Amino acid sequence: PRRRVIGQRKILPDPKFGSELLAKFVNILMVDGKKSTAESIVYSALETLAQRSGKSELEAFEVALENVRPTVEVKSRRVGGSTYQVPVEVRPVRRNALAMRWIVEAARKRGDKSMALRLANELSDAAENKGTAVKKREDVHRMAEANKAFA
Amino acid sequence: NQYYGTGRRKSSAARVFIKPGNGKIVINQRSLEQYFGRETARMVVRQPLELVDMVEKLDLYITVKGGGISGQAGAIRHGITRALMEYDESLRSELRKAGFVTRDARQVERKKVGLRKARRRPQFSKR
Amino acid sequence: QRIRIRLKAFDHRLIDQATAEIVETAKRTGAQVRGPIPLPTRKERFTVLISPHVNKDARDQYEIRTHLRLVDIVEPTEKTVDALMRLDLAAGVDVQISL
Amino acid sequence: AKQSMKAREVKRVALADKYFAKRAELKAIISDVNASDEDRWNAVLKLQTLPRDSSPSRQRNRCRQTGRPHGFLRKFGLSRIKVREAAMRGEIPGLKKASW
Amino acid sequence: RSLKKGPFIDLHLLKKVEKAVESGDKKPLRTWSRRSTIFPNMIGLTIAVHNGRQHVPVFVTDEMVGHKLGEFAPTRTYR
Amino acid sequence: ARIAGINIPDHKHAVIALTSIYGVGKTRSKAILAAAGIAEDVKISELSEGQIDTLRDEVAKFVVEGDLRREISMSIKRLMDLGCYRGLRHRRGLPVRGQRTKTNARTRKGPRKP
RNA sequence: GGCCGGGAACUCAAAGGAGACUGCCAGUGAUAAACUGGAGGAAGGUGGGGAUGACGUCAAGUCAUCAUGGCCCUUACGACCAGGGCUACACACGUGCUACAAUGGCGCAUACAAAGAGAAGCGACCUCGCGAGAGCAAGCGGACCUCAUAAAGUGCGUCGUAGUCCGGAUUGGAGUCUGCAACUCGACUCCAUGAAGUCGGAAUCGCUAGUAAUCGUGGAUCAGAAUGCCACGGUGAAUACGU
């Protein structure tokens, strides 16, 4: 806005574990006001993912995210009649938001049988450094690097 | 002796009586697990007793009516907080700083003429 | 036996005046009365268009309210019934008496 | 409205009041089960000789002050325009502008 | 329409049909009654039905029974 | 498996599979299977010759396939020949149950013609 | 089983009252007006939502709600009556409803609302019909009777990516009800048939918190005929670095 200051909304932690990050993830996954379905899908995915790697769900989730967090990005500027890409730094909250959004978008486009299965597959592949999420990170970083002259 | 509290949320009202000893909760003549099938609702109802270390020292008799699931859970939490304050009168600081002593005054907005909902307008075309 | 009175009005000051009058007369003639109990109010709504031609927004919303009261007399006597039936009240209060 | 339309309305109401009971009897005959099965045919043939305007469903509500056939309210006997005029002048007991 | 009522017909039409059948030969019969079901005792006759401007002559056959009279005199002109 | 002159799937349940006949819906499928005495979630692959003969006998009681098609064609032809309102609509290709024709009507008119 | 005797404590109903004022604390500022923080409190700085529309602009809309200056017709541009039309159909545009599916379809069985209407009216229990409905009949001018069973949800099975157990246009046969009367031209039920469509070019709209999105419920006009209009609650987000 122009002359406004906006505070931060409180978010309740998850019931099974106690993390607000997982609550934000469930929120980003939900559609049409159906929170119970999203909670089911997330919990099933984390359960099926813990076995594959022999570590706690929180640790697996953190490992998956650390390979998709971005650092720099490009904005568009046009004051002289031409569009330039300008590289800017990202802050931690936006890092987390973008990581989760990309993960979910990549999962939705897969071709397995159930949403839980697709999510588990995507999380495992991300931990192994493969998939569309990591591809998106790399593309954004390439675009940021190609325009260092405009900083 | 009994300690009493009234609680409210969206469209729900809850009457909470608390007595001392051997923690057990009855709600509308059923158990907590029978009544609520949602982990979030259970956690909400259980919060204040977890916050103040008295989980296994008080029996709770509750009645509630109006609304849905989340509204009723919130009403119950509010009522428990009021009853505990009546019982002790020194946990007020902790309960307030946690955030259970405030009433949540969020209601449903009305429909208005010329709109499809409270804030949604029809589609607009220039030509 | 027992007597029941129901009163209706569009104006609550008028209804309270009438109720106080009835209670006073009843009590003064040596008969117990159970204080007036308020009952739910009725709200009726209307919506109209305010232009003689096309314009479809631009409406007006109106309301009418009806107030209701109920009074109980537990042990009527002949003099009490006579006193009640020989009373007159305002012209905007509707009174119904049941035995 | 025109002067002839209200005349039509008055005529309709009069006839519909005149012929009420006969129609009720004939319709009871036709509706009731275990009838002669020939009285039914005769009654059906007879119910169509009574004048058409005698059926209550040929009537149309109109405002009592002007005659408008659209925008009618039943509690007041008038159309929206005249309802608003009376309401602002103060001639409808209990009515006032509402908000909530 | 309901089966517990029987088919509908106009009294004047029914009387005209009775008279024509008993008296034998009949030139076409003029009618404005398009809401009358066709009865079996009508076959062999000519009914001229209104359609808005003129009267269309219909010569009754045995496959028409159960139909209304109006279905054989359309009301609109299209080309 | 052949039933009424056609082959019905073999990996489906009986209630779904039987509906491949032109004249058998879900209700008639349930009725036939109840009359024959077979379950409803049994695959057509695990039946026997006796069961299949029973099902053929059950299906024989209805009108199906060519006879049904002949009936429909004769019905429509009767009207088209008589020349009533419905018949004219049938033989011009415009809707018959009194719908709108200022717009829409595209299942009876086909795709647009500029 | 609030059933019964009871109680006036609690939910709740509807009349009188109290409360929020930059009133108190620290800092900045012209020894100002104000601004950024904190205490208590249900609520804090316009607490949230309504009604309330300045002098004027567009010879803007309405002589078909009503009233009125001037013009025009009076065996007719005024009366009455049955049939038809306003529902047409090579085509072009605006506003909506249902979908193109596994965050799903189908079968069983089990929680939790709010606000309304009713005498030429709302119609319980019982019996008959696969069903829309039919017969006989209590109660209610109503915090009492009736309309009236909320749905999404939760638990257990089946379907396994197919133009399908996704979608439900069109058409054939047989019926129910209102009404003198359902051809043109009504709503609803049963059996059958099972079209287009696999997320939509250039353009382009709504929304800042109990909001968007999604699920059900009621009323006015009304013999009968809402996917429109006006109202009610349940579940419940994402983002605002800046000009």
- What DSSP string describes chain A? --S----PPP-PPPSSS--HHHHHHHHHH--SS-HHHHHHHHHHHHHHHHHHHTS-HHHHHHHHHHTT---EEEEEE-SSSS-EEEEEE--HHHHHHHHHHHHHHHHHT--SSSHHHHHHHHHHHHHTT-SHHHHHHHHHHHHHHTTGGG-
Fold of the domain spanning C2-99: Alpha-Beta Plaits (3.30.70)
Q: Strands of E29-31's sheet, edge to edge? A: E29-31, E46-50, E55-59
Nucleic acid strand G within 7 Å of D14 CB: no
- Planar angle of CA A6, A10, A13, nearest 5 degrees: 155
> Smallest CA–CA separation between B2 and chain A, in Å?
31
Please indicate whether, in this complex, the C-beta atoms of E63 and F86 are within 8 angstroms of each other. Answer: no
Side-chain half-sphere of F36: how many Cα atoms within 13 Å?
24
Separation in Å: G236 C1' and B110 CA: 17
Identity of the residue numbered B104: D
Number of domains in chain E: 1
End-to-end Cα distance, chain F: 49
Residue B108 lies in domain = 1-127
State the Cα–Cα distance between residues C6 and C16, nearest whole angstrom: 13
Protein CA A17 to sugar C1' G238 (Å): 23
Contact B48, B95 (CB under 8 A): yes
> CA–CA separation, B76 vs B63, rounded Å?
9
Q: What's the CA gap between E29 and C47, in Å, rounded?
A: 56
For chains E and D, tell me whether 3 or more CB atom pairs sit within 8 A of each other.
Answer: yes
For residue B42, give the nearest of B77, B81, B83, B17 by alpha carbon: B77
In whole angstroms, give the CA distance from residue A2 to residue A123: 40
Q: Residue E9: how many CB atoms within 10 A of its CB?
A: 19
Q: Percentages helix, strand, coil for chain E, rounded to the nearest 5?
A: 25, 20, 55
CB E77 within 8 A of CB E66: no
Find which of A26, A34, A36 to mutate to test the B interface (most B CBs within 10 Å of its CB).
A36
Q: Based on the number of CB atoms within 10 Å of its own CB, is B11 exposed (0-12), middle (13-18) or buried (19 or more)?
A: middle
The residues facing C48 across adjacent strands are C60
Q: Using CA atoms, how far apart are residues B5 and B17, in angstroms rounded to an integer? A: 7
Among C52, C58, C65, C92, CA closest to D96: C65
Residue D69 near residue D55, CB atoms below 8 Å = no
Distance from C-alpha of A40 to C-alpha of A119, rounded to nearest angstrom = 12
In angstroms, rounded to a whole number, what is the distance separating the alpha carbons of residues C43 and C65? 5
Nearest to D41 among E4, E6, E10 (CB): E6
Backbone angles phi, psi at E75, to 5 degrees: -105, -15
* D45: chain E residues, CB-CB within 8 Å: 11
Residue spans of the domains in chain C: they are 2-99
Cα distance from E38 to chain F (closest Cα, Å)? Answer: 14
| Chain C contact residues (CB < 8 Å to B) | 47, 57, 59, 61
Q: Is B111 on the interface with A (CB under 8 A)?
A: no
Query: Is B77 exposed, middle or buried (CB count within 10 Å of its CB: 0-12, 13-18, 19+)?
Result: buried
* Residue type at A142 in one-letter notation: R
Residue E7 and residue E36: Cα distance in Å, rounded?
Answer: 8
The residue whose two tokens read 């056939």 is D69
Assess C46–D contact: CB distance below 8 Å, yes or no: yes
* Resolution for this experimental structure (Å): 2.2
Experiment type:
cryo-EM
> Which of these, D48, D52, D55, lies nearest to D20 by C-alpha position?
D55
Nearest residue in chain A measured CA to CA from B99: A10
Is D41 part of the contact surface with chain E (CB cutoff 8 Å)? Answer: yes
Of B68, B78, B69, B11, nearest in space to B40 by CA: B69
The β-bridge relationship of strands C33-38 and B12-20 is unpaired
Residues in chain B: 127
Q: At what angle do helices A115-127 and A132-145 cross, to 10 degrees?
A: 50
Cα separation, B67 vs B74, in Å, equals 11
d(CA E72, CA D62): 39
What lies within 8 Å, CB to CB, of A65 at 6+ separation is A96, A99, A100, A103
Alpha helices by DSSP H, D1-100: 3-18, 20-31, 39-46, 80-89
- What's the structural domain count of chain B? 1
Quick one: closest CA in C to B114, which residue?
C57
Reduced 3-state DSSP string for C35-56: EEEECCCEEEEEEEECCCCCCC
Residue F56 structural domain: 2-65
Distance separating alpha carbons of residues F30 and F17, to the nearest angstrom = 11
Beta strands C3-9 and C59-73, pairing class = antiparallel
Contact D10, D59 (CB under 8 A): no
Whether the beta carbon of E54 falls within 7 A of nucleic chain G: the reply is no
**Under 8 Å between Cβ of B18 and B12:** no
State how far the Cα of D89 lies from the Cα of D82, in Å rounded to an integer: 11
Query: Å from B30 (CA) to G162 (C1')?
Result: 47
Beta strands E46-50; E29-31: pairing state: parallel
State the Cα–Cα distance between residues C71 and C31, nearest whole angstrom: 13
Q: Other C-beta atoms within 10 Å of D8: how many?
A: 15
The enclosing H or E element of E50 equals strand E46-50
Q: Which 8-state DSSP code applies to residue C22?
A: H
- Chain G nucleotides close to protein (CB under 7 A) are 10-15, 40-43, 47, 49-51, 61-62, 65-66, 78-85, 87-96, 102-104, 111-114, 116-117, 120, 134-135, 142-143, 150-155, 158-161, 165, 169-173, 175-186, 190-195, 204-214, 220-223, 229-243
H or E element at residue C73: strand C59-73
Judge if the beta carbon of B97 is closer than 7 A to nucleic acid strand G: no
Distant-in-sequence contacts of A53-62, Cβ < 8 A, 24+ apart = A53/A124, A53/A127, A57/A17, A58/A17, A58/A19, A60/A123, A60/A127, A61/A21, A61/A22, A61/A123
Interchain contact D88–C (C-beta under 8 A): no
Q: Long-range contacts made by residues A109-116, C-beta under 8 angstroms, separation at least 24?
A: A115/A41, A116/A41, A116/A44, A116/A45, A116/A48
Question: Dihedral (C-alpha) D14, D20, D22, D24: value to the nearest 10 degrees?
Answer: 160
Q: Are E7 and E69 in contact (CB under 8 A)?
A: no
Chain E contact probe: residue of D44, D49, D50 with most E CBs at under 10 A: D44
B122 touches chain C (CB under 8 A): no
| Interface check C49 vs D, CB under 8 A | yes
Q: Which residue has the tokens 């079901």?
A: E37
Mutate to test the interface with E, among F80, F84, F94 (most CBs of E within 10 A): F84
Q: Domains of chain A (ranges plus CATH)?
A: 20-147 (1.10.455.10)
| The residue type at F87 | G
Question: Whole-angstrom Cα distance, residue F54 to residue F81?
Answer: 42
Instruction: Name residue, tokens 């006998």.
Output: F57
Rounded to 5 degrees, what angle do the CA atoms F93, F98, F103 make?
70
d(C-alpha A137, C-alpha C84), whole Å: 90
CA E1 to chain CA centroid, Å, is 17
Dihedral angle computed from the Cα positions of residues D72, D76, D82 and D85, in that order, rounded to the nearest 10 degrees: -140
Interface present between D and C (3 or more CB pairs within 8 Å): yes
The answer for residues whose C-beta is within 8 angstroms of residue C42's C-beta and 6 or more apart is C65, C66, C68
The beta strand positions in B48-105, using DSSP E, are 58-65
CATH number of the domain that F10 lies in? 1.10.8.50
Fill in the amino acid letter for F85. Answer: Y
Separation between Cα atoms, residue B82 and residue B96, nearest integer Å:
11
- The pair of three-digit structure tokens given for residue B52, joined into one six-digit string: 């103040």
Q: By the 8 A CB rule, do F77 and F92 touch?
A: no
CB A49 within 8 A of CB A116: no
Question: Least CB-CB distance to C60: which of D71, D84, D94?
Answer: D84
Which chain A residues touch B39 with a CB distance below 8 Å? 15-16, 39
As a dihedral over the C-alpha atoms of residue B22, residue B27, residue B32, residue B36, rounded to 10 degrees, the angle is -170
**Class of residue D90 by CB neighbours under 10 A (exposed 0-12, middle 13-18, buried 19+):** exposed
**Binary contact (D73, C46; C-beta < 8 A):** yes
Residue D66, SS3? coil
Is strand G within 7 Å of residue E41 (CB)?
A: no
Domain limits at E38? 1-79
Q: Is the CB of C66 within 7 Å of strand G?
A: no
> Is the minimum distance from the CB of B67 to strand G below 7 Å?
yes
Q: Minimal CA–CA distance to D80: which of C51, B46, B50? A: C51
Q: Tokens standing for A106?
A: 């990549």
**Chain A residues contacting B, CB < 8 Å?**
12, 15-16, 35-36, 39
Alpha helices, DSSP H only, in chain C? 12-28, 78-85
Amino acid letter, A118: R
